[PDB]
Symmetry: C2
Amino acid sequence: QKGNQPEGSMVFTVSRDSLPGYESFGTIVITYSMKAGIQTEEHPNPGKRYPGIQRTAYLPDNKEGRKVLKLLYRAFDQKLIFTVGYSRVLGVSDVITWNDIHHKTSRFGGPEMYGYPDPSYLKRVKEELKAKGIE
Amino acid sequence: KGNQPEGSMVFTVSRDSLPGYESFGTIVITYSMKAGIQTEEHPNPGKRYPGIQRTAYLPDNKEGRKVLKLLYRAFDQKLIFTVGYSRVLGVSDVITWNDIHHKTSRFGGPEMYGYPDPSYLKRVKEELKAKGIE
């Protein structure tokens, strides 16, 4: 239902250029700009500061991509796109992290590079949103 | 020449404007950097670092396009990123910027690494000149 995402903003814009696998369409560019803050009782280490982050994600500008954009706005409103805590790979804590809804942060390079082509990505991200009760 | 990890730099444009640069579009630069193993040119040779993805923004005006061309040269000369200490993460052994500052937000001004910031394009050109890209 409702998460512990930091304060911040979500905006988007579009480019006429295409993503691999979606050559008939332009590209949605989502920018998240999240503020530095102090962990609340809603976070794993209350009282400890965390820095802000900035992240950009990409979607094809087609009916399905715009539906996912709408669902991501819903998740952002429900404070579910990001959380604060441990970041698995580096094993650092007290940082802003993603929250199990994967975003393509590269245009190209396929899944190895968190980019396109990735023909099942839109289906996968919808599954991840549904797991948060967002459909 | 620097010691930037393997990776790619691409750009595209949006018709929407950045604060302070009304009636020009927005250049969107995407950097896609591969995980790797530190070389002898890095601070901890032999240690692995994970890949990163970063997007940066510039106004699509004359000055912004000049900066884009210079950033392409810097990327070609392996100077945009390095591997080392990140104060944000509080660790080293990660892919970091290399003292060529990028705006990773559209909005929110300097505190958010975004626009408006009337002195940014001058600053980034100076930082490029410091690496001999001019």
